[PDB]
Design a protein around this ligand. Structure first.
Ligand SMILES: Nc1ncnc2c1ncn2[C@@H]1O[C@H](COP(=O)(O)OP(=O)(O)NP(=O)(O)O)[C@@H](O)[C@H]1O
Ligand SMILES: [Mg+2]
Ligand code: NA
Ligand code: NA
Ligand code: NA
Length: 321
């Protein structure tokens, strides 16, 4: 249970219906090529009519449980542009994503431990064109942030704000504030493409009401692979795509090296800041989002998700003074 990988297949979108061959079909564990021999097995495959409540309760809720018990937990959404990462991780008021569901779930679950005092604090950062910025601190205080390595060789983002929250409502208002500064852009593939990697973090601390359990819960919505022939991107949008594709290539190389056996975490800000999530001291989950009418991008995503199944994390309960 240190590392687990699932797939989420979305329904077809407006763009795909205006066209498309279905390359992929699924059951709850296997995604297989329609008129070919390729197949991939996962601990869970979600189909197009399964909701983000199903994804949340099966994949994320146990990671929230482990965070309350003092384990670091990280959930990544990975997949091609317009495959469903932001839909799954953030969603909307109409149908909540993993991030807002985790907030409600945390505030409800900590009431089961009245003999424990909880302190919760949130951070929200973006990695855009290999620059790290604080989405919470408001525009006038935004600046490129530095990754440092502390006395225990833990990596951290220097001067990233951490906001104490006492209600679900307060946490959700911080997410809203951060979303205002997040980089989005219009392409032919997604009218609201995520042009950066985003990391929503909760630090959960608890102690007996009478030592302190500390968990970092990192909920990560990656940018997605994209091609100029599909996006019609030019100028800054096209530059963003190049940067995104480069960063995902590096994440795949780090995952491949971990699966085999030194590890090139330093080649991207994303692999450096989440090094502890990739072979380290946390429980990591990967939600691989795919569209079934893609062959090459879906194949790349399934091969990444397959390789990540073999990543060896060694999580333990984090207890300090
Ligand atoms: N499971 C789903 N069910 C229904 N609609 C979905 C689903 N997944 C995605 N969508 C739709 O597809 C749109 C684009 O999905 P979105 O999550 O923004 O893509 P993405 O993977 O985040 N792409 P990008 O940020 O460009 O790399 C959403 O706004 C929804 O309309
Ligand atoms: Mg997105
Ligand atoms: Na097959
Ligand atoms: Na087959
Ligand atoms: Na990027």
């Amino acid at each position: 249970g240190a590392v687990a990988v699932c797939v989420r297949v979305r329904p077809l979108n407006s763009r795909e219906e205006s066209l498309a061959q279905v390359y992929w079909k699924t059951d709850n564990n296997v995604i297989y090529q329609v008129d070919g021999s390729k197949s991939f097995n996962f601990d869970r495959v979600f189909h197009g009519n399964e909701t983000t409540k199903n994804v949340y309760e099966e994949i994320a809720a146990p990671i929230i449980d482990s965070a309350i018990q003092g384990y670091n937990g990280t959930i990544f959404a990975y997949g091609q542009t317009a495959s469903g990462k932001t839909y799954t991780m953030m969603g909307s008021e109409d149908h909540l994503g993993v991030i807002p569901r985790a907030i409600h779930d945390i505030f409800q679950k900590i009431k089961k431990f009245p003999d424990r005092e909880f302190l919760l604090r949130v951070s929200y950062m973006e990695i855009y064109n290999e620059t790290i910025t604080d989405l919470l601190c408001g525009t006038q205080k935004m600046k490129p942030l530095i990754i440092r390595e502390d006395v225990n060789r833990n990596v951290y983002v220097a001067d990233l704000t951490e906001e104490v929250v006492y209600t679900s409502e307060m946490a959700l208002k911080w997410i809203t504030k951060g979303e205002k500064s997040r980089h989005y852009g219009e392409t032919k593939m997604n009218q609201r493409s995520s042009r950066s990697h985003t990391i929503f973090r909760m630090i959960l601390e608890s102690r007996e009401k009478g030592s302190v359990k500390v968990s970092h819960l990192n909920l990560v919505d990656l940018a997605g692979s994209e091609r100029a022939a599909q996006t019609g991107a030019a100028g800054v949008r096209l530059k963003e795509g190049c940067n995104i594709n480069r960063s995902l290539f590096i994440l795949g190389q780090v995952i491949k090296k971990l699966s085999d056996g030194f590890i090139n975490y330093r080649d991207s800000k994303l692999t450096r800041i989440l090094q502890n999530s990739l072979g380290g001291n946390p429980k990591t989950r990967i939600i691989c989002t795919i569209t079934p009418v893609s062959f090459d991008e879906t194949l790349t995503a399934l091969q990444f998700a397959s390789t990540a199944k073999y990543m060896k994390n060694t999580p333990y309960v984090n207890e300090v003074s």
